Design a protein around this ligand. Structure first.
Ligand SMILES: Cc1c(C(=O)C2=C(O)CCCC2=O)ccc2c1c(=O)n(CCc1ccccc1)c(=O)n2C
Ligand SMILES: Cc1c(C(=O)C2=C(O)CCCC2=O)ccc2c1c(=O)n(CCc1ccccc1)c(=O)n2C
Ligand SMILES: [Co+2]
Ligand SMILES: [Co+2]
Lengths: 381, 381
């Protein structure tokens, strides 16, 4: 059931912003590790004396990496005279965010029709305001409300190239890397109580619960009208024999925050081959591969969607497979992106639900918890 | 003249420690960009609840990358019961260092015979103490004194594998990268006044001034007995038509600090080829290449040390060349390693002065200031 109760026109995921200590090194690491191009910059060389911001892009996926310069460089500025390209930025907020949480996502940004109305309706509907609507060069409007923890949901809207005050990057600095990633599929929060967090966010967006099909978590998924913006949220389940990875997250992150970004690939096999070649030379590591028992059991479950040759390719790459009543889902999880066991990345590709492809086709892989538990005990035998 | 006035037995450069916001991402970036192996770790998986520390090595060059975890993880610890592998670490010091300076070098570490005596003699001779001598597992002794700004000179001494509490890294995590870098040649500080900084450091080490052969700086080089530990220091020269890059550094670094690390290569041409292939895919950028006039003038100055084929290879790679009365020096400079125009890296290789090779052979390239100025105006013509 999809009641389509969005309280404002929501278009699509626009970008994800990481708050860093050093944006250059994180961005260069992510660029190599994920196959993303350097697309835009706002920094000293563009006149920004407040923050360094570098945009990576792969298809529709836009990763923004932002760190503060010394406050001394902008001491004589006030918000009306600021050189920052992102006026919601604040030296003390960013430094407090990073010291409290380590490297992680600050903003989940979605494009809307009118960021100012989306902000007014949102706060009128219970959203805790974070940064009011400001208009950039009479061209782009941007506003922020609190999402969970210190993560903001950021509304952006264009009258008609990333933001005013950003420059496109010189082609000699911009190497055309691409491992096949194309857009953001979902962004997942970890919170200590799912109920109040669900009620809050659904409260001010009008997003509806997305329908599904005992280890770790309870979760639930909020979604926009066409279900192209997907915001799952997890909470821990305490008492479990193995400690909740949601609870571990909350402890090391110092509270609620963004758990994982799921990145849709147009060819998950080439993406994984390319990322795995680079795991030990600057890129990203992947979680331990499931036992062969997991793949000996794949034929019985998805042997109608993938060939034996494509099944054995999943085993080579450690790809996990789950299925809905409408589609099948291929997925894999990186190890944590930074020092803390907090944020990590998921690579996915969906099969089915053509009408274009409808969002969430295949679900989010919750059944794979059961499949790996069974495969793990079966492999001991 | 080398009066050999070291007040304690100084062996060699041992390691350089960067204080980071996220040690994982900086270390992975530096690993790819420079060709350094993952050699040792001290982090959550080794029992360290205070900091994440990852060691990169290439030959004798040891780069250490350290960031703090949440203080909450170690709240019940006291210094006697600490799980930190580096007992001089302090959450507040590291966070203050990084917020003030951005990414940069915290510790310049040299191996000595007895770190505890080197600390006592140093402070007895004017050194501002920073962290007193502590003995690790009855095996390694380590102590720190202030060097300049917030950079400490760190003494380490072994009775007889990096430090106690570090683990060697599993070979599947440790990809054997190597672009030919082999050791640290010199580490250079920027200070607002060279005189008092020179007097201070020479004061407590006994290091002697190293003899040389109007744009930017005055500098001078302190050196240990065998001249294998080399510590140049720069100050700005104000009034210059072009602004002093030392002054720019001090402004963006919020005070004195480490300007550049010079890394000796056993084959500078292969090092540069390998680093340049990776500049735009996660590695490091290099400063703009000198004009061809600079290389048309190389034959007249060094055409007795390098072939025409090796001269044109310098032009391909943008390598600079200078010469002493005892040796010749090949060098090149990266762009800044992080967001701020502060710390950068120099790759060098020395020719001559065989006895082994004596340190500082060829000097530090000061003549190249003049050569590029002349080449720049000659190339306009
Ligand atoms: C995050 C994830 C998802 C996922 O995407 C996600 C959603 O989008 C919607 C809400 C529910 C949800 O979970 C799906 C399957 C996963 C995982 C996952 O994190 N893990 C790792 C576990 C683990 C941790 C610590 C130690 C050992 C194992 C899995 O095994 N599966 C199989
Ligand atoms: C650091 C450096 C060295 C060097 O190693 C060093 C020492 O070890 C000992 C003390 C003196 C010293 O300097 C040698 C030559 C350099 C540079 C250098 O930094 N630069 C860049 C200038 C510049 C900046 C900003 C904008 C444009 C140009 C050079 O051109 N030369 C030619
Ligand atoms: Co997911
Ligand atoms: Co130098």
């Amino acid at each position: 059931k999809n009641p389509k109760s969005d309280k404002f026109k929501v278009k699509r995921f626009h970008h994800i912003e990481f708050w860093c200590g050093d944006a250059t090194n994180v961005a260069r690491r992510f660029s190599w590790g994920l196959g993303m191009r350097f697309s835009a910059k706002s920094d000293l060389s563009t006149g920004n004396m407040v923050h360094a911001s570098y945009l990576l892009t792969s298809g529709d996926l836009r990763f923004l990496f932002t760190a503060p310069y010394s406050p001394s460089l902008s001491a004589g500025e006030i918000k009306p005279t600021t050189t920052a390209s992102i006026p919601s930025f604040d030296h003390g907020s960013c430094r407090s965010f990073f010291s409290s949480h380590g490297l992680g996502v600050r903003a989940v940004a979605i494009e809307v029709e009118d960021a100012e109305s989306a902000f007014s309706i949102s706060v009128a509907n219970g959203a805790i305001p974070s940064s009011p609507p400001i208009v950039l060069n009479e061209a782009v409007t941007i506003a922020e409300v609190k999402l969970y923890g210190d993560v903001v949901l950021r509304y952006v809207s264009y009258k008609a190239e990333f933001l005013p005050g950003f420059e496109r990057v010189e082609d000699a600095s911009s190497f055309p890397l691409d491992y096949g990633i194309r857009r953001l599929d979902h962004a997942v929060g970890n919170v200590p109580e799912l109920g109040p967090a669900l009620t809050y966010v659904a409260g001010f967006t009008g997003f509806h619960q997305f329908a599904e099909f005992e280890s770790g978590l309870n979760s639930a998924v909020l979604a926009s009208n066409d279900e192209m913006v997907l915001l799952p949220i997890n909470e821990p389940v305490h008492g479990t024999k193995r400690k909740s990875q949601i609870q571990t997250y909350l402890e090391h992150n110092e509270g609620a925050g963004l758990q994982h970004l799921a990145l849709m690939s147009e060819d998950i096999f080439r993406t994984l081959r390319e990322m795995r070649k680079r795991s030990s030379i600057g890129g990203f590591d992947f979680m331990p591969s499931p036992p062969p028992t997991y793949y000996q059991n794949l034929k019985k479950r998805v042997g109608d969607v993938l060939s034996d040759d494509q099944i054995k390719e999943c085993e080579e790459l450690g790809i996990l497979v789950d299925r809905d009543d409408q589609g099948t889902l291929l997925q894999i999880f990186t190890k944590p992106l930074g020092d803390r066991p907090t944020i990590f990345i998921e690579i996915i590709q969906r099969v089915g639900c053509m009408m274009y492809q409808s969002g969430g086709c295949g679900g989010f892989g919750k059944g794979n918890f059961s499949e790996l538990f069974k495969s793990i005990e079966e492999y001991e035998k």
